[PDB]
Amino acid sequence: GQISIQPTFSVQRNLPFDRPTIMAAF
């Protein structure tokens, strides 16, 4: 599935990501 984000709009949000899964494969 999706584990990250790619912003398209300029808004003050926080760009989420699945940190434990991204660093697991390192």
Added chain:
Amino acid sequence: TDGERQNATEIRASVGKMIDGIGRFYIQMCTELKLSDYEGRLIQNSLTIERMVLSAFDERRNKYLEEHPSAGKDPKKTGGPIYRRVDGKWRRELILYDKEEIRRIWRQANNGDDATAGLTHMMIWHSNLNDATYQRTRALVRTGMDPRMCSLMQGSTLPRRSGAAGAAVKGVGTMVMELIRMIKRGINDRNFWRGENGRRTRIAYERMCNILKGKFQTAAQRTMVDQVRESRNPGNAEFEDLIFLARSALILRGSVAHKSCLPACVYGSAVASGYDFEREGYSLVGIDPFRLLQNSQVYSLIRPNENPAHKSQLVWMACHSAAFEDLRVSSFIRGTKVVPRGKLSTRGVQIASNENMETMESSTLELRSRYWAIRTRSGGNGQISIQPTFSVQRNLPFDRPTIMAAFMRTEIIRLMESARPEDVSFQGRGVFELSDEKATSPIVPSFEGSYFFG
């Protein structure tokens, strides 16, 4: 600034001229295919017309078709499904058109010039629709890439004909897939990277490595791509190195351009309404697309047992290229909750040949957003010297360690560990109102899922 206003005005006119051609061409084709107002505003009909244009200008494929014609299909005619409503029911009839006839019609609509910018714009619109609708994990696995990096798959369906304009909008993951396929062909074929053609492949490999490098933001990522480019005979080492680069892009996101490329039916309706894009100008990242969609009514074919709102949200997502954007931000701008792909009770917009075109009904698409925002080409996330002004005996200070400092893989891993899924990006930038055409007062949102393909 004050000098880039002119340049900004120049760009607006040039894009407005492209939008005018698309609308003028669509109007001409609608009157030539004999389509009524309802059928002219059908998204399926616009898709067929757009695809006919793209195939008519496909010089390479057309040449191959001429040399090796397909079975029962002459390589000089194109077409697609045109849907007409007679007696209240919908029917599909396959239209065949001469590619020379379509090319002449397109050129006449753009004042006799080729205007490949309009074609690339339509190709981007198709790519955005494909990204929001279909998920290509099979290509990710087949190239050896982890199927989880679907957030970087922006513009993976863009044909190679879209250079520069197409390359700017495509993402890190798609770029890496292009590099990997080049690597795989070299490993499988020893003649690759050698001979007259190997020289051509090498220059192509260099160019797309540079544009991939410019997509990154951290210095560590750019240096890693620069090393891979230098490899004269790339192999598994670059294969793994690029795979690491793609995984790093999930945290240290690259710069992917986002543009709102609308269907040609919207432009055709606007141009027929007397609207002059060339005069007042246009912008694919500003308020212009949002304002156009507010006043534009578009119909679509809805298959039996399908929620019209979910299809409209899918078209809304494709229009603004927000397939991989946060659901919370998309929900805020639209004003109605955006659902993940798994909870969308709809199939693709394009209708298949084998589909019973008798239980199909049409509905109006709700392509209206409560707010409007500026599309970004940026990802996520002082003075070091002096310039004397007065004649004084002071010493001119500078930050020696930092200036001389700028003269691999462990560094990249360290960078992403520091990053956390809470950092505020685009600080102070919000979402405006449709009545606020000058982007004066931003509206910063306060924020359950956030992954469309989750």
Added chain:
Amino acid sequence: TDGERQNATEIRASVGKMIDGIGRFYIQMCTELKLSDYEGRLIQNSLTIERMVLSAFDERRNKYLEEHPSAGKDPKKTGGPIYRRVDGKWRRELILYDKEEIRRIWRQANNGDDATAGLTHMMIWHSNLNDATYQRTRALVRTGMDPRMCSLMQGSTLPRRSGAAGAAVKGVGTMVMELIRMIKRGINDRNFWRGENGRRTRIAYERMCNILKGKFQTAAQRTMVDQVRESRNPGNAEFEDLIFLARSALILRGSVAHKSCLPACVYGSAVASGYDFEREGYSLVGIDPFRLLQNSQVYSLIRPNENPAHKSQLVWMACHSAAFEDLRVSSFIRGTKVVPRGKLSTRGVQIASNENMETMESSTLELRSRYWAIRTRSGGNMRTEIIRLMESARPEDVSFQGRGVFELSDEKATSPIVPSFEGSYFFG
């Protein structure tokens, strides 16, 4: 010398005639816009009047506006926010004026001559104000340059209309950014550098490279910029050496001219006082700007919850182009500590339309300095040789040996006052 006394006196009169034209024109426009003594001395009003003249003489943009008119704005009329105080409160009303009427008023104030020097002088004043107020890392990042070289962006907002005079005051970073845009355009467009227009672009590329070469001091930097000029089809390689040249300027700084361009309100007040700049003469690098500012009183519109001292410091720095200068030397000259940009509780001087012009009050700007110094066009003191030079360079070498700061009463700059010296970076 002894022969350049006549030359210096001649130059002083020519600059004084330019300032007299600026002052005379402001007086007429104030009398013709019907502005009271207080409103005429408002810095916001002076900027609006200045911006009206600059746009009235923009032949290229005016032509484009005629050919391709904007929406709701006729291309023959200009104007801006004029702030009028009646009954204690401030209100803003947009004034619309014919660009030809503005041109006639300006020309008549200069005895019927175009006087392009006055327009460029106002353009330099606006650039100095923009440099001290706003930091353009977006353009640096967009063009591919590291945003850390914000000290070399002097005069980055100056329009191309300010030639010679404008190029002298602009910095290495702005010159490099201009070249980098040319390279980026050439790389993207294959027809660039080719055809009749390519020849015109080539001469522009050569000329702007020549002024950049003259801006440098070390022989190594000049040779490398000479190499970049010789490239018939510059590309990524010429991209890199220009970036390297920009980075070397942080240590081996170039020669950037610094001139004190005051707001037109100060000149209008002085001319109304009877001062004859043509007779007494003027100079943008001497004591004249300092002595004018000491006796000049100017007001500004203060947004709520804003320190007037910080806004006055911002205007003082923009007046003398001390945006990128050492804070210690700037503090020593002014007499009151100059705070870095991050610690300034103020926004830009110009007020936006979306701002409620009802909670705004006015304050007097303290544009007076305890000391005065002479503005400098100089810095301080292949590629491996360039890196070797900046390695020997230390952030302790004394520059301008024996050259100090004088008193306002010492009009001949006879006895220098050498300072003895905690931050020093405005944008840091």
Added chain:
RNA sequence: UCUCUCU
């Protein structure tokens, strides 16, 4: 002139 969310 094809089709597909999610190995």
Added chain:
RNA sequence: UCUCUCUCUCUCUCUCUC
């Protein structure tokens, strides 16, 4: 007749290993 301190809040690009 615009606006802004501090990473792109707008600066396209005139299509492909044809």
Added chain:
RNA sequence: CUCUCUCUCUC
């Protein structure tokens, strides 16, 4: 470079 330039723009 402690003052010795500037009459404008790929108009």
